[PDB]
């Protein structure tokens, strides 16, 4: 079945996006059509995965006879699957025998005849709370077009035999011919591996049907369905032959243009008009300039002064293909907290064709560039910061990628005074360096690291989350693994890398509960119980 996602211009676009459609994955909306211009533009539609909004239609007849069912995945306003209103004389939705979710709204239709007598009881399903059908079973057009009553368990409209393999429209999904409650799972449990495994017979979900792979440009989501595009919290990534909607690692890639190229080609800095154009933005394409004109304001460019609280918009930036110039910062902030998440400064286009990181003449105590790890092309100049203390500690040669890069840290707070005022980084910090006064602002640390912050040592013997050390880092092991005082509660990651499990253990993997009711091999559910030794045994 083919699928789809001035008044003259409206009809053309509508007919274009609906002439070949047979199953609509979205909402069928026929609105604003002029007199005597509809001519079999949409007659083959048999399924709408959403709501059917036929509003303000001057045409005498909107053909929708084949329409078998409206899914109701969306609504017009609320619980509104069929929205026929303010139109239209003949609307023969004869095949319409089911509206899973939503109700039909009848309003402002004086010309609509032969539809007030329709049996909406057989179509609308359990959504009568908002059924204002107020504007003999026959949709119209004399005979032939009748309501074909059938209602007044996976077949929605009707049945053509007492078999699930033969029905008009499946209530939930249709693998290839039989009506299934859900699509074959993509993960299959195998008692031999005591865990989940990719299921070959498992098929992705394509709207109201199950497909081994989704054709055209569709992206499989986490729950097995392949929607048209990945969500806001997900990104498109193609591992195997089909791309999948992998979850974004926090704020994922949103490449915007920086200062010098694009809409900010003639802009000088990130002033108030610039701010908000960098919201939830990562991997700036261009340079990032923060000049005094931003906070002072500019009259010639007609830009109000940038209030310092809007500088947190740049907290999303994790890469800058150009350079970072901070010639002005709010004086009430002791560090560049807007660039704490910045990780790479490619420097492709550097200040004066030289500096890619330039913190100049600021009133900040620390740099606050904890996540900064790579400065590829340009060098670094941190000067004029009369209150900058933890600046020379960082081994800049580690971040640099090109051997020719240098660093011009000069005229900041003296190191002698820096250590005299008690402003020396934490002892939990490898000589590699420190970005600030706390272990969070540490390039590297003496023994371990719990994320950005690094403690004295992992919870190998005592601790609340009971970390286990690996590659000089604290990893909180599976919660299932109970704390162990004699040795280390957990050898490694996963529920199969600890000596003692607080909850039951399925084979080698400690689990909250033994696997019960999960789909297993040969399309058979598997259930497991627990013995006195907390081991999960197959039933």
């Amino acid at each position, epitope marked *: 079945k083919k699928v789809c996602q001035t008044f003259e211009d409206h009809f053309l676009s509508l007919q274009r996006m609906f002439n070949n459609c047979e199953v609509v994955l979205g909402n069928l909306e026929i609105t604003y059509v002029q007199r005597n211009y509809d001519l079999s533009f949409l007659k083959t539609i048999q399924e709408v995965a959403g709501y059917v909004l036929i509003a303000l239609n001057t045409v005498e007849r909107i053909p929708l006879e084949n329409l078998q069912i409206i899914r109701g995945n969306m609504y017009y306003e609320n619980s509104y699957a069929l929205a026929v209103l303010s139109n239209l004389k003949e609307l023969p939705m004869r095949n319409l025998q089911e509206i899973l979710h939503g109700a039909v709204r009848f309003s402002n239709n004086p010309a609509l005849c032969n539809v007030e007598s329709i049996q909406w009881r057989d179509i609308v399903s359990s959504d009568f709370l908002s059924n204002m059908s107020m504007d003999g079973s026959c949709w119209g057009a004399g005979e032939e077009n009748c309501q074909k009553l059938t209602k007044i368990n996976q077949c929605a409209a009707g049945c053509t035999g007492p078999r699930e393999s033969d029905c008009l429209v499946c209530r939930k999904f249709r693998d290839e011919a039989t009506c299934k409650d859900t699509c074959p799972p993509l993960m299959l449990y195998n008692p031999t591996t005591y865990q989940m495994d990719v299921n070959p017979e498992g098929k992705y979900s394509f709207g109201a049907t199950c497909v081994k792979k989704c054709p055209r440009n569709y992206v499989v989501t986490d729950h097995g369905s392949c929607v048209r595009a990945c969500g806001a919290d997900s990104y498109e990534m193609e591992e195997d032959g089909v791309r999948k909607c992998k979850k974004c690692e926090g704020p994922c890639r949103k490449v915007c243009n920086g200062i010098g190229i694009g809409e900010f080609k003639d802009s*000088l800095s990130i002033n108030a008009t610039n701010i908000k154009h960098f919201k939830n933005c990562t991997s700036i394409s261009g340079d990032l300039h923060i000049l005094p004109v931003a906070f002072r304001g500019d*009259s010639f460019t007609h830009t109000p002064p940038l209030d310092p609280q809007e500088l947190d918009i740049l907290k999303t930036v994790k890469e800058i293909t150009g350079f970072l110039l901070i010639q002005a910062w709010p004086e009430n902030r002791t560090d560049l907290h807007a660039f704490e998440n910045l990780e790479i400064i490619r420097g492709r286009t550097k200040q004066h064709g030289q500096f890619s990181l330039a913190v100049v003449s600021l009133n900040i105590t620390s740099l606050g560039l904890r996540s900064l790890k790579e400065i590829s092309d340009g060098d670094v100049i941190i000067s004029g910061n009369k209150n900058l203390c933890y600046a020379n500690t960082i081994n800049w040669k580690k971040l640099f990628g090109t051997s020719g890069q240098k660093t011009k840290i000069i005229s900041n707070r003296g190191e002698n005074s820096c250590k005299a005022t008690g402003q020396v980084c934490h002892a939990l910090c490898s000589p590699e360096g420190c970005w600030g006064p706390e272990p969070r602002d540490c390039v590297s640390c003496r023994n371990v690291s719990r994320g950005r912050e690094c403690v004295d040592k992992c919870n190998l013997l005592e601790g609340e989350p009971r970390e286990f050390v690996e590659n000089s880092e604290c990893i909180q092991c599976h919660p299932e693994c109970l704390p162990q005082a004699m040795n280390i509660t957990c050898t490694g990651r996963g529920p199969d890398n600890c000596i003692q499990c607080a909850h039951y253990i399925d084979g080698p993997h400690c689990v909250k509960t033994c696997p019960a009711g999960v789909m297993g091999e040969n399309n058979t559910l598997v259930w497991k119980y627990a013995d006195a030794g907390h081991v999960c045994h197959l039933c």
Partner: single-chain antibody, 230 residues
Framework: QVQLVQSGAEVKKPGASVKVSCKASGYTFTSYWMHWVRQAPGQGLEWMGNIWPGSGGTNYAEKFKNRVTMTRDTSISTAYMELSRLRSDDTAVYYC???????????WGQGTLVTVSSDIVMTQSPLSLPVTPGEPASISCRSSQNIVHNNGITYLEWYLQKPGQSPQLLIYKVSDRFSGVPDRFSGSGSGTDFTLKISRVEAEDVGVYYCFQGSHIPPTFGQGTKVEIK
């Protein structure tokens, strides 16, 4: 303190080129626009283009776009204005102003008189209005279009060019008065009509008042009312 110094005392010939400097001191010269404004005799102040010393990105007026070149000297903190193909009407007084944040041309250069010889129209309803010391005066100004900028801030300004000195900002906004000027001046108006109301005319108040707009691409001044004592 901020102090902008121009070369001054320039005399040229028609068809020649003149270049004047602006030694800007007391502040970071690269953090502020360096506007250039001309005051031809018989006419009010006329904007002729600016420059951003931090990057050298200059803007221009349509009457000087193909005729004037402005370049900055970052190391010595001095902006320049080169006017070529001088005509008979090019004789004027050239000021190197300095754009602020809520206002325009906070500080002005003393002025360079280049005497050479062989757009939202802002018009002030009065012209050379005489008053008596003590009696309140009122200078109205009419704009050709609505100068309320899209951002919601109208860049209406009143400049008092006292005899022998450069223009000085009095009302930095439609009504917001500048720092260092008395409460006597009180700008007023909205939309298209703007009037400046002096509550008490004093001896020092004599001078030419120019209603200025900066909300359009070319900033334009008004003809100027020569307020004088009766």
């Amino acid at each position: 303190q901020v102090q902008l110094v121009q070369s001054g005392a320039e005399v040229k010939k028609p068809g020649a080129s003149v270049k004047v400097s602006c030694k800007a001191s007391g502040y970071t010269f690269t953090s502020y626009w360096m506007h250039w404004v001309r005051q031809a005799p018989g006419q009010g102040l006329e904007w002729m283009g600016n420059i951003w010393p931090g990057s050298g990105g200059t803007n221009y007026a349509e009457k000087f776009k193909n005729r004037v070149t402005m370049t900055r000297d970052t190391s010595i903190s001095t902006a320049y204005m080169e006017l070529s193909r001088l005509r008979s009407d090019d004789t004027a007084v050239y000021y190197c102003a300095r754009s602020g944040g809520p206002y325009f041309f906070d500080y002005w250069g003393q002025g360079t008189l280049v005497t050479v010889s062989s757009d939202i129209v802002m018009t002030q309803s009065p012209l050379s209005l005489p008053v008596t010391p003590g009696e309140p005066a009122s200078i109205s100004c009419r704009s050709s279009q609505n100068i309320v900028h899209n951002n919601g801030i109208t860049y209406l300004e009143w400049y008092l060019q006292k005899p022998g000195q450069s223009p000085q900002l009095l009302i930095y906004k439609v009504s917001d008065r500048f720092s260092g000027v008395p409460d006597r001046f009180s700008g007023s108006g909205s939309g298209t009509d703007f009037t400046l109301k002096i509550s008490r005319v004093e001896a020092e108040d004599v001078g030419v008042y120019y209603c200025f707009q900066g909300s359009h691409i070319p900033p334009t001044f008004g003809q100027g009312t020569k307020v004088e004592i009766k």
